[PDB]
Amino acid sequence: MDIDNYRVKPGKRVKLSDWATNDDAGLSKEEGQAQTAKLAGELAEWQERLYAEGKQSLLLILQARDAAGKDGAVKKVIGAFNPAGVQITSFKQPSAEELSHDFLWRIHQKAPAKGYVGVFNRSQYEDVLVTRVYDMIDDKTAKRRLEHIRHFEELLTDNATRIVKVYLHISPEEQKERLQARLDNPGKHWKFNPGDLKDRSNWDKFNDVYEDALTTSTDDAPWYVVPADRKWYRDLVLSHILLGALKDMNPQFPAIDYDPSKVVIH
Amino acid sequence: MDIDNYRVKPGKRVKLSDWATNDDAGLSKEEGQAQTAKLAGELAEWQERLYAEGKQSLLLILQARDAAGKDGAVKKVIGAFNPAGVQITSFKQPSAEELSHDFLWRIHQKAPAKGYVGVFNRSQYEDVLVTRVYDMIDDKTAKRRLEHIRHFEELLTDNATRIVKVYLHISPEEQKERLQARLDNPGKHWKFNPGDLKDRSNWDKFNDVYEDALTTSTDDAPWYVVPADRKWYRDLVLSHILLGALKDMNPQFPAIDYDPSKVVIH
Ligand SMILES: Nc1ncnc2c1ncn2[C@@H]1O[C@H](COP(=O)(O)OP(=O)(O)O)[C@@H](O)[C@H]1O
Ligand SMILES: Nc1ncnc2c1ncn2[C@@H]1O[C@H](COP(=O)(O)OP(=O)(O)O)[C@@H](O)[C@H]1O
Ligand SMILES: Nc1ncnc2c1ncn2[C@@H]1O[C@H](COP(=O)(O)OP(=O)(O)O)[C@@H](O)[C@H]1O
Ligand SMILES: [Mg+2]
Numbered sequence: 001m002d003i004d005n006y007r008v009k010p011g012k013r014v015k016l017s018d019w020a021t022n023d024d025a026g027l028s029k030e031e032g033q034a035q036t037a038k039l040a041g042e043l044a045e046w047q048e049r050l051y052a053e054g055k056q057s058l059l060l061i062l063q064a065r066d067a068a069g070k071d072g073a074v075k076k077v078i079g080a081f082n083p084a085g086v087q088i089t090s091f092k093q094p095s096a097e098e099l100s101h102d103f104l105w106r107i108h109q110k111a112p113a114k115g116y117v118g119v120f121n122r123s124q125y126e127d128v129l130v131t132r133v134y135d136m137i138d139d140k141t142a143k144r145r146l147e148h149i150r151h152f153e154e155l156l157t158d159n160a161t162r163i164v165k166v167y168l169h170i171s172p173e174e175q176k177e178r179l180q181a182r183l184d185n186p187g188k189h190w191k192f193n194p195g196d197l198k199d200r201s202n203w204d205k206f207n208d209v210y211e212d213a214l215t216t217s218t219d220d221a222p223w224y225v226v227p228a229d230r231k232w233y234r235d236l237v238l239s240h241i242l243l244g245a246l247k248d249m250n251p252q253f254p255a256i257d258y259d260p261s262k263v264v265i266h
Numbered sequence: 267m268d269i270d271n272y273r274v275k276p277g278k279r280v281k282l283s284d285w286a287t288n289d290d291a292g293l294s295k296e297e298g299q300a301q302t303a304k305l306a307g308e309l310a311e312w313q314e315r316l317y318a319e320g321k322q323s324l325l326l327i328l329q330a331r332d333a334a335g336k337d338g339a340v341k342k343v344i345g346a347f348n349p350a351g352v353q354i355t356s357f358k359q360p361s362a363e364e365l366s367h368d369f370l371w372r373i374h375q376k377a378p379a380k381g382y383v384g385v386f387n388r389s390q391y392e393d394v395l396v397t398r399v400y401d402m403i404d405d406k407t408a409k410r411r412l413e414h415i416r417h418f419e420e421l422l423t424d425n426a427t428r429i430v431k432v433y434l435h436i437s438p439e440e441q442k443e444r445l446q447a448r449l450d451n452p453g454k455h456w457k458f459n460p461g462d463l464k465d466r467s468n469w470d471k472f473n474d475v476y477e478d479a480l481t482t483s484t485d486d487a488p489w490y491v492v493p494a495d496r497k498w499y500r501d502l503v504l505s506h507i508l509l510g511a512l513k514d515m516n517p518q519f520p521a522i523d524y525d526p527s528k529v530v531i532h
Binding site for chain 1 (some may be wrong): 316337339340348349350352354356387445446453455456458460463520522526527531532
């Protein structure tokens with residue numbers, strides 16, 4: 001398994017048809033889940049070092065279609081961290097106050113603080129995705145917003161915020177099964193709504209706007225196209241993406257301002 | 267077991283000395299850890315239902331002395347929840363802007379939203395604890411603030427926010443062991459500073475002000491004194507306290523207003 005094959009290389013436009021949705025790296029469901037469990041412990045040790053150092057931060061931007069596994073990726077992978085060093089934000093339709101500001105106003109407010117892991121379940125890229133498919137903005141506006149997004153991610157990069165953008169990539173047939181599954185199991189009826197089917201009818205339009213958004217992939221702010229047909233594999237790759245980022249950040253425990261040898265606890 | 271022995275009953279004044287610090291309910295560390303692990307799954311099932319329903323909220327208020335187990339209780343017990351349905355806040359020294367407002371301003375801002383679990387690592391009670399030991403306020407101010415806190419907790423209770431306040435109860439000699447360990451292990455020097463020792467020298471003054479604070483215990487907003495000398499036991503009791511609240515709240519999955527069988531996913 002080379003995780004870098006899933007990284008959108010800088011400057012190269014992408015075709016979603018050229019990326020697989022159901023890779024498994026020649027691993028069984030058990031070998032993957034077992035390895036994902038071992039990585040869960042590794043993720044925790046490094047998230048503790050990140051919080052102790054208090055100099056850097058990690059920002060995961062999760063973008064995907066309905067039933068792709070955003071909720072499951074957070075519950076399984078992000079659940080490995082100490083929840084006190086994590087901040088999760090699920091961006092839904094902008095409120096009235098949010099619309100009275102530029103489109104990055106509400107986004108910037110949730111940027112992670114030093115020492116924290118930040119997650120955007122849906123993010124600023126919504127403003128150049130669903131907003132385009134349904135003609136809330138035109139191509140001119142969309143293009144400029146993408147330039148504004150790059151600069152925003154460049155701002156946070158110089159602030160020591162390591163950016164990682166992940167797109168969970170599934171096939172239409174896999175989505176069909178998962179949507180039918182929510183309709184068949186009484187316990188999950190609440191996760192399905194008459195409107196997940198509208199975005200489905202515009203599947204090919206979302207391909208175009210998603211491929212546009214992926215052009216923001218740089219060395220400092222990379223995109224990853226993660227085959228997500230297999231949920232265990234989705235979790236396994238994301239485990240590798242986040243831990244590999246954490247290890248490259250190499251957070252060191254903080255210095256002390258006292259002499260331990262000379263302290264007398266009364 | 268009986269968790270109700272650890273609940274400060276309404277209207278009755280208490281002395282912390284009346285509670286043991288190293289209870290175990292006749293369980294070994296292993297049988298306890300096993301029980302804590304078995305309950306983690308139930309906490310998760312009910313936290314998902316609470317978030318799915320979106321009508322109620324759970325507020326945990328954590329108060330405890332140095333090396334008593336605030337961070338460890340959160341990492342172990344609160345770590346059972348999906349971090350997307352949780353909000354943790356560690357209240358430190360008030361900032362300048364926070365001091366320019368009433369003492370509950372920064373607290374109220376962090377009240378949990380419907381469907382969420384909220385945790386306060388240190389809380390509004392700091393304003394009637396450390397503020398008194400070091401003569402930042404007088405007895406008259408402290409007494410009135412305690413009334414304002416009860417009203418505040420009554421406000422959130424009528425909002426369907428289930429309040430639960432926990433005090434982790436350890437002995438001085440256990441604190442001495444835990445602090446000396448950080449001075450002895452180089453890997454833990456960063457968790458200690460010669461300032462953790464100031465509150466320790468005023469242990470008996472904190473007894474008085476903590477015992478005053480416990481009088482806000484009501485049927486709706488109870489306090490709990492949890493013997494915390496044994497770290498595995500702290501985690502076991504807190505799991506029971508929080509799961510008992512979630513089960514008593516009894517959050518229900520939301521009903522649907524459509525017929526899944528006649529939905530046609532093209
Ligand atoms: N900036 C934005 N402008 C318009 N719509 C947005 C924006 N950001 C998010 N949304 C929309 O909010 C909705 C949130 O859906 P959500 O309830 O999270 O779906 P599910 O829970 O089924 O995954 C999405 O349909 C998304 O397109
Ligand atoms: N010296 C140590 N040995 C073993 N575990 C430790 C040590 N120091 C801290 N821990 C871990 O940290 C937790 C204690 O949390 P702590 O930081 O004392 O909370 P508080 O904020 O009240 O000081 C323990 O449950 C344990 O998991
Ligand atoms: N409302 C408040 N007024 C005055 N001091 C406060 C208040 N809330 C918290 N503090 C103080 O802030 C300090 C935070 O200590 P620190 O060790 O940095 O936090 P923690 O141990 O919780 O990680 C504590 O000594 C506490 O007394
Ligand atoms: Mg939905």
